[PDB]
Amino acid sequence: IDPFTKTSLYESTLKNQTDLLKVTQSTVEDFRSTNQSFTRALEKDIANLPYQSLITEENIINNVGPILKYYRHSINALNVYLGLNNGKVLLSQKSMPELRDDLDIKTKDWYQEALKTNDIFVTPAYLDTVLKQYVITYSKAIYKDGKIIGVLGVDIPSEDLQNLVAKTPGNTFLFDQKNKIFAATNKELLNPSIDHSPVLNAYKLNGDNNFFSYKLNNEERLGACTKVFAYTACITESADIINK
Ligand SMILES: CCC[C@H](N)C(=O)O
Structure with a gap:
């Protein structure tokens, strides 16, 4: 009851929840940075091959193939590949890399977006054509002496990020670019019929990392969200810690 005591519990739980929100944010950052560094190392190993190893398709197969596999x-x-300007892609796929001419790579955003940036491009999650699993793709236009060799692509199962986020402490969860629930420690939050407007509206009014209160079934809850790349990471708890 005493306003001194209520304030001290509020500050205390605010610190705990925002600490745990940061753990989930860091989880997403570390996932992306690990994959980007991987893709950069692979780009460098392909680009460092002699030109002779790169200028025939058979040499690409025999000299880039093993690298993609390793x-x-x-x-x-799930998949690692190099897309070539003739529309063919050298593909190293889960369950010997082969040159494939039937995957329409020049229509794929991972291909075309890599050509418009000098950075690694990261897709949203989408259904992989090759193995029919949801993936996040990291892609990179490879250049040697200013000449494009092709577009490198690396597919990581989006389930990997979901499991990473789910294992974090706290009632943390992650929205994707379309504000659709993407990952959650509490699996029940993945129910597609749940209305997330209360917590998203509270976030919209308060801003990144700013603790807020909101209502659920006429009961008070506390939470905070922050943008992480194009995701939105949130945490929420009951307000009983301050009220009881
Ligand atoms: C070989 C390209 C594979 C990529 N996951 C896709 O669906 O385009």
Whole structure:
């Protein structure tokens, strides 16, 4: 009851929840940075091959192929590949890299977006054509002496990020670009019929990392969200810690 005591519980739980929100944010950042560094190392190993190893398709197969496979294995990627300007892609896929001419790579955002930036491009989650699993793709236009060799692509199962986020402490969860629930420690939050407007509206009024209160079934809750890349990470708890 005493306003001194209520304030001290509010400050205390505010510190705990925002600490745990940061753990989930860091989880998403570390996932992306690990994958980007992997993709950069692979780009460098392909680009450092002699030109003779790169200028025929058969040489690409025999000299880039093993590299794609060793990298795929090292990180347990789903697919690792190099897309070429003739529309063919050298593909190293889970369950010997082959040159494929039937995957329409020039229509894929991971291909075309890599050509418009000098950075690694990261897709949202989407259904992989090759193995029919949801993936996040990291892609990168590879250049050697200013000449494009092709577009590197690395597919990581989006389930990997979901499991990483789910294992974090706290009632944390993650929205995707379309404000659709993407990951959650509490699996029940993945129910697609749940209305998330209360917590998203509270976030919209308060801003990144700013603790707020909101209502659920006429009961007070506390929470905070923050943008992480194009995701939105949130945490929420009951307000009983301050009220009881
Ligand atoms: C070989 C390209 C594979 C990529 N996951 C896609 O669906 O385009």
